Design a protein around this ligand. Structure first.
Ligand SMILES: Cc1cc2nc3c(=O)[nH]c(=O)nc-3n(C[C@H](O)[C@H](O)[C@H](O)COP(=O)(O)OP(=O)(O)OC[C@H]3O[C@@H](n4cnc5c(N)ncnc54)[C@H](O)[C@@H]3O)c2cc1C
Ligand SMILES: Cc1cc2nc3c(=O)[nH]c(=O)nc-3n(C[C@H](O)[C@H](O)[C@H](O)COP(=O)(O)OP(=O)(O)OC[C@H]3O[C@@H](n4cnc5c(N)ncnc54)[C@H](O)[C@@H]3O)c2cc1C
Ligand SMILES: Cc1ccc(CC(=O)NC[C@@H]2CCCO2)cc1
Ligand SMILES: Cc1ccc(CC(=O)NC[C@@H]2CCCO2)cc1
Ligand SMILES: Cc1ccc(CC(=O)NC[C@@H]2CCCO2)cc1
Lengths: 586, 587
């Protein structure tokens, strides 16, 4: 147990010191390493439950049982007198840099998970390389370091959402006494895009500065794993070479899918192109019904656009379907048009006008599920029909890394693949929620286990979400239909209520915002799922995710007192059950 | 044990049925009571763990151990055959209305706590009266049903806060691509006040309708408790009379204080006056440093006003002082002036308020600083926010025997009972309790259930979360850092903290003013003793964490929970810089 932990920690740590906080010989070794700029992990034996057992087990490696003991890449280097001797003789720098491999860690992919993993590993003395390359979109769009969220995901989409929310703030301001006239104000797309891209540029630069300051090697190159320890890299000049590493983290993410229909790749775009587009999309069709499709259609409508969404079957498949339909009803009431039960079968009428900075024109042909025909003209067609990895480009078949039927990596609960030195994090890890804070937690926690002897695993259960549609939807835990399937209808109680934000009163809807708690009767009314549709839904939901993590019950919500006036306080006084049939309106 | 719970429940309930869900004889009695419009509490014995023992103890009152059993005001009425005998003999209505008192419950005070208590009690067949009267301010301001929060408190102040927040929404919109020019837009006070007052009027009306539909008697009259069961009421025509009640709930709240200086009552105003003021205050002085003072100064500045705050000593006494200073620093950088370590000596009138042309007067304020230097400056409006106090002499005759504390608030047990066994107190007048609207509502509803439905649940007053709605909002739950250090010692306290920047603030162009921290106890598994956040939407951020803190959250619970991105709140899930480390908290 302890001995198996100690052997795993010594084998994989790059530079590690076993120590006690009160030992002045240990302080002397710490000061020499700091002076020589040698980064390392430290384990303070006097602060661990079984320090005495670990101290004994160390002798199986070093033949001594005292502290300090310093190791480099699995090899005992010395005690205090010995480390000082190497320092005085100018031999220490060469010893701590001796390695069978070029790097202790190679990260393939410089996004949310990979950057987090690489920076954390470098803190413990691991010699680290992060590779990042952005293959251009079909029309040629590309961007800088930081991954999908930073460049073409959470960051620009929430800034554009905020631009949309400000339209209603302008409307509300007249009712609260301000002299403006909303009807005479218009929106400039390119001014917004320039501000969004200036912020993204500051993030690209900030990540390169962070890697430099952590002594991480950044290679803007495409990587391919060709054997367990060998990574083939390809240059911006197409120069090909091979680097070796002890541990490998795969962190390459996903890219958007296109449907296999004529004209889709040639004449449509995806979210990858939208957030830097130099002209306003104009009259727009969004094909798809994911959170990406609905978030983009939502802000485009608030910015003044003529927007239609083509839905094959349902909205937000995999989310609670009562809440999904309330999300869509709000958008349809506030200007978004929906072509329901419909799929596309794209023709070009005008080429994009780079001269005068204007979109082209397209004819879209499709059909409804009953066979009736769809035919209509649009200036822009955005496909949001899912995302996928392309691990065939990243991973030679002969390495032995197992994939599932969707092409994602099959991992143990510590992110290990079927190849013992190779790990995977983020969107390519099969069966995990595909979210930026999950990829960051996974990468930081894994680096600590590899290079600092940590044991803590990432917990992937009950991870909260928020969909940033024009009225936002936050959730944590099970949908109501999933709870009933798992436990049976008679064991599920649902408390629910409508509400009206106080900010909406003077601004003139009464009963559109909504929240519910899905509970298990036979387990002390445990809260299985929380759902809220309303303003600031992500800020509302986050704190409750801690309480659900700790096993909150309905009684825990009841005994906590509300903060007034807020939207969130409605969760503390819920009482109407769905079984009662009583109306949830206010 | 069980037996004296049953005794209390039977003595106190107005109309209560002991039942079982599968009993068809109980179903017939229920349906009879519903047809006759008789409201009542119900105890289903087949659902309580010791319902067997309760069945036995019922015999001590009724000499039977079967179900159903109906009681009215402590007297056994009958089983199924006997209840139906009374119904078809036209004898039931008289029996269920027989009472020694005019009412089962009299609530003195129609505000947050009193309206909640009265409505909940009526749901169980208690015959209930709610008394409310609003004594006018010195300049004559008055308002309708619903109490301090509804009329001159949480509701209008947060609406005026939102009007102020929309000024920065207008500035931000230009950076996000909208074509407006913020510099050419102005604010109209009276248009605001009309919208705010129209919403308050809808709440006044809604409460009157709610009381009518619950069969609660509403008396717009001043109440005075003259003996344990007698309440003297005074009419709008000065008519005096007396009504009697079994249980009494005191829920009369507080009103603003004035300093004892010349000119204060005559020429200044309070928050009672501000929210319906018919003219814009103009150049304004706020005297005091409570959350009322700072919230009001904040929105007046954001609406374009010239605003000064006169501070005797510190800001937000009783709140975390690191956070209080950050709140004030933001206000001073965004257009609120502060006269620090300063108190007033007199208000002199220079110009009388012009009712016709709808304009303020003009005043001269004289004061001095703590070192001895002098203060002298003219203002159009002077607002006093130097605390609030109850006036229980008006409400409560000394001979009744209800004990007060040295501040004049009612001394109560943990179930809100006073020193007089049938009299209870809730809300701001209950000594030692947090003075907040959702506390008063929970106390009132929970008390009503114990009195008339045999409930046992008490109100929990610990770790109640708060939010100060200053221009940059401040949310908190639990201990301040200084209180935790005093309680446990500095070596046993660890503080994790960080600055943050809302994503919404990036394109709009400050980096390091929003701030959050967790104050934790090392020797108790790093228990979270207090949570603090300064930033936008701070009440929405804080609320959910109050459930986790109620449940005993540790730092490890915050670490294992995953963030929602992009939000301000997610910064709580990845905190790692400690104050003891000396590492900077900036972004
Ligand atoms: C429109 C949109 C909105 C989103 N909004 C949110 C949101 O609000 N909240 C949220 O939590 N999540 C959101 N997400 C999801 C979030 O973007 C992802 O979960 C996250 O980016 C996954 O990080 P990752 O490290 O797994 O991969 P990525 O961030 O995609 O990083 C992988 C990187 O590796 C590079 N790469 C690929 N192949 C190679 C190779 N062979 N060699 C070198 N480099 C390579 C890629 O080009 C990329 O830069 C959104 C996603 C999209 C598309
Ligand atoms: C400016 C301001 C802002 C506030 N903001 C907030 C906030 O954001 N959040 C929050 O939680 N709290 C806030 N509060 C506090 C909140 O208003 C109080 O905690 C709450 O109103 C107290 O409720 P109560 O039932 O005890 O008394 P009240 O609501 O004051 O009701 C008592 C009622 O009884 C009446 N009455 C008095 N004497 C008699 C009598 N003899 N006969 C008949 N009727 C009588 C009073 O006139 C009044 O109508 C604020 C308070 C102020 C002043
Ligand atoms: C067509 C096109 C245009 C611009 C860019 C940006 C760039 O400079 N990419 C550098 C990578 C490193 C490996 C191959 O190219 C890429 C592709
Ligand atoms: C606005 C809006 C748009 C689209 C939808 C989805 C839809 O058409 N749902 C019906 C399906 C058929 C199978 C089960 O329910 C809802 C709401
Ligand atoms: C903007 C603003 C205004 C007022 C204050 C309070 C103050 O003046 N503090 C000085 C010393 C420190 C403790 C006692 O007084 C702070 C910040």
């Amino acid at each position: 147990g302890t001995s198996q932990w100690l052997r795993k920690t010594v084998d994989s740590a790059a530079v590690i010191l076993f120590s006690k906080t009160t030992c002045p010989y240990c302080k002397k070794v710490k000061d020499v390493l700091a002076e020589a700029k040698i980064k390392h992990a430290t384990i303070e034996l006097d602060q661990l439950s079984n320090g005495s057992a670990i101290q004994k087990c160390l002798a199986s490696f070093s033949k001594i049982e005292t502290v300090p003991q310093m190791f480099v890449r699995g090899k005992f280097i010395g005690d205090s007198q010995t480390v000082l001797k190497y320092y005085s003789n100018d031999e220490l720098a060469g010893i701590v840099n001796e390695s069978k491999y070029d790097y202790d860690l190679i990260v393939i992919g410089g996004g949310s998970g990979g950057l987090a993993a690489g920076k954390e590993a470098a803190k413990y003395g691991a010699k680290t390389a992060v590779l990042d390359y952005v293959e251009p979109t079909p029309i040629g769009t590309t961007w800088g370091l930081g991954g999908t969220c930073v460049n073409v995901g959470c960051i620009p989409k929430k800034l554009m959402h905020q631009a949309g929310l400000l339209s209603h703030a302008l409307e509300d301001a007249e009712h609260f006494g301000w002299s403006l006239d909303r009807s005479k104000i218009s929106h400039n797309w390119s001014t917004m895009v320039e501000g969004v891209q200036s912020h993204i540029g500051s993030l690209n630069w900030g990540y390169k500065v962070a890697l430099r300051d952590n002594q991480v090697t950044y290679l803007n190159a495409k990587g391919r794993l060709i054997s367990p320890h060998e990574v083939q890299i390809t240059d911006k000049n197409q120069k090909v070479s091979t680097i070796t590493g002890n541990k490998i983290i795969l962190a390459t993410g996903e890219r958007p899918k296109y449907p296999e229909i004529p004209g889709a790749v040639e004449y449509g775009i995806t979210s990858d192109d939208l957030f830097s587009l130099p002209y306003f999309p104009g009259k727009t069709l969004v094909i798809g019904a994911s959170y990406v499709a609905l978030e983009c259609a939502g802000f485009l409508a608030s910015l003044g656009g003529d927007v239609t969404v083509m839905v094959r079957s349902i909205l937000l498949r995999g989310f609670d379907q009562q809440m999904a339909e309330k999300v869509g009803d709000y958008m349809e009431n506030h200007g978004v048009k929906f072509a329901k039960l419909c799929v596309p079968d794209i023709k070009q009428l005008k080429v994009v006008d780079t001269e005068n900075n204007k979109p082209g024109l397209l004819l879209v042909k499709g059909h409804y599920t009953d066979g009736k025909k769809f035919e209509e003209e649009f200036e822009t067609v955005i496909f949001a029909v899912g995302r996928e990895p392309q691990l065939s480009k990243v991973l030679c078949e002969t390495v032995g890394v197992k994939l599932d039927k969707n092409g994602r990596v099959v991992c143990t609960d510590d992110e290990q693949t079927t190849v013992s030195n190779v790990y995977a994090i983020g969107d390519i890890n099969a069966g995990k929620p595909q979210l930026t804070p999950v990829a960051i937690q996974a990468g930081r926690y894994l680096a600590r286990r590899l290079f600092a002897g940590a044991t803590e695993l990432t917990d992937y259960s009950n991870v909260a979400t928020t969909v940033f549609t024009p009225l936002e939807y936050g959730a944590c835990g099970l949908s109501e239909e999933d709870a009933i399937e798992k436990y049976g209808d008679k064991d599920i109680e649902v408390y629910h209520s409508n509400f009206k934000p106080l900010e909406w009163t003077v601004a003139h809807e009464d009963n559109v915002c909504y929240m519910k708690l899905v509970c298990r009767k036979s387990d002390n009314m445990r809260v299985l799922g929380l759902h809220v549709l309303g303003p600031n839904a992500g800020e509302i939901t986050q704190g409750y995710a801690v309480a659900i993590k700790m096993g909150a019950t309905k009684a825990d919500f009841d005994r906590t007192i509300g903060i007034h006036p807020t939207c969130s306080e409605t969760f503390t006084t819920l009482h109407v059950t769905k079984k009662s049939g009583v109306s949830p309106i206010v």
